[PDB]
């Protein structure tokens, strides 16, 4: 029983612990969100197929790691799926050929919120898997651990809806112009969606956000968001109605606003957070 990565590198077995680097491609789905499919990433074979058959099984206690350690879901494994983290021992994979075949494993995540997700950085631990290898000749019972690491920066969706971008930068023209914000939302299944903005406001109605510009800031002005002519104050919920697999635009537009008194030239910058909720 030996394994190698999609790039041909061999995966060591039976050390203190083995670290495997894979590419993630999360996608939102109905019921279960996909984290990483390992069938395209890990390949294993058997160098003595005529005289020994190798059995590999996923042991109990396998779970997510790192920033995903507190999440739960399911695991695809050889023709069926089981709850994750594993509370029992999974059935066996059989390796009886010298030809590399995929390790049929994929990890899923149970949605917990409306949109929202945890950001994964390259080289961060994703899951700790416990494997038990046995054979039909020896009576040996060998346990080893694989540590799954990401080699690309992605964001795992923790909810049932996703967005076009997690960070959006827009550029207003010089005072007093305005620009639209290209932000859209879609959900794997029909849902009632609404969002509310957040940040440090600077007025009574709390619709105007403070100028955060670090270098040569302009004073007496702030940033105020509006959708289709209506003004959205912070900490107030805006409803979108039913949303589905077809992307729905939020329709937000960013404008300059005047507060306090005399306005002085300089730079303007605000950072506004958008949050989603069910209805």
């Amino acid at each position, epitope marked *: 029983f*030996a394994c190698k990565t999609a790039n041909g590198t061999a995966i060591p*077995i039976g050390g203190g612990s083995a670290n495997v680097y894979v590419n993630l491609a999360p996608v939102v789905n109905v019921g279960q969100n996909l984290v990483v499919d390992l069938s395209t990433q890990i390949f294993c074979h058997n160098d003595y197929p005529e005289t020994i058959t190798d059995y590999v099984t996923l042991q109990r206690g396998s779970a997510y790691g790192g920033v995903l350690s507190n999440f739960s879901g399911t695991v695809k494994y050889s023709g069926s799926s089981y709850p994750f983290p594993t509370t029992s021992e999974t059935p066996r994979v059989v390796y009886n050929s010298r030809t590399d075949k995929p390790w049929p494993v994929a990890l899923y995540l149970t949605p917990v919120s409306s949109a929202g997700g945890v950001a994964i950085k390259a080289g961060s631990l994703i899951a700790v898997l416990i494997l038990r290898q046995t054979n*039909n000749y020896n009576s040996d019972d060998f346990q080893f651990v694989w540590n799954i690491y990401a080699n690309n920066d992605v964001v795992v969706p923790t909810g049932g809806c996703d967005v076009s971008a997690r960070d959006v930068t827009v550029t207003l023209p010089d005072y007093p112009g305005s620009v639209p914000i290209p932000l859209t939302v879609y959900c794997a299944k029909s849902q009632n969606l609404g969002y509310y903005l957040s940040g440090t406001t600077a007025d009574a109605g709390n619709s105007i956000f403070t100028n955060t510009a670090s270098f040569s800031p302009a004073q007496g002005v702030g940033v105020q968001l509006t959708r289709n002519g209506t003004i959205i104050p912070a900490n107030n919920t805006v409803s979108l109605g039913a949303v589905g697999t077809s992307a729905v635009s939020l329709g937000l537009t960013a404008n300059y606003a005047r507060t306090g008194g005399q306005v002085t030239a300089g730079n303007v910058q605000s950072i506004i957070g958008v949050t989603f909720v069910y209805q």
Partner: antibody
Amino acid sequence: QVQLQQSGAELATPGASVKMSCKASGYTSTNYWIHWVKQRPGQGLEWIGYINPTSGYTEYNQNFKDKATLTADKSSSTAYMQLTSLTSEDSAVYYCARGVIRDFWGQGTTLTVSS
Amino acid sequence: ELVMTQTPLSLPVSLGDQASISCRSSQNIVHNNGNTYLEWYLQSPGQSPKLLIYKVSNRFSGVPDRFSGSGSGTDFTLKISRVEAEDLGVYYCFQGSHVPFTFGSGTKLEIKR
């Protein structure tokens, strides 16, 4: 390649103890077992045991269970055999074989136990 | 343990003839998984043993076609279609089914004259 190069020649007094080496291994495949075989001058071959360097699993011939200890170091990829309380009966040629079915043999080590 | 007995003890042959050696086991040597682990090894003058046939009938990668293994149950035979100089040495049969593993008594194949 990483191939079975063994010790040279060893001379020991009765009793005493000696440790032999077989310089090849790798902890990437579970099927590279190392077998040890004994050949006395003029006689045939005897299988002593084998160890799995990747997991440390060992099989022993019960005729040798008081004599031979099998171990392997994962760093140097070197397997070891130790013989204790040597007698004249332990003088022989010792081979190490790689594979589940002993498909690659080593050069051999000659041991003479004399006073 | 189980005893492996080979016959004949010495097999004098001339270069070119057909050579056959026999190895009889003391008990059934089928493994619990159904495979029979009977092996044939060759040791040449001043050289370590090398594998010839690894599952009764299979030929190890790189063994010429001269060698052919056959048998079943308790009696097995190795046959050499035409004898060359490279085939001179001591031949051992090996069982790897029941612990402890055992080798054959050894058969020397030499020149006839």
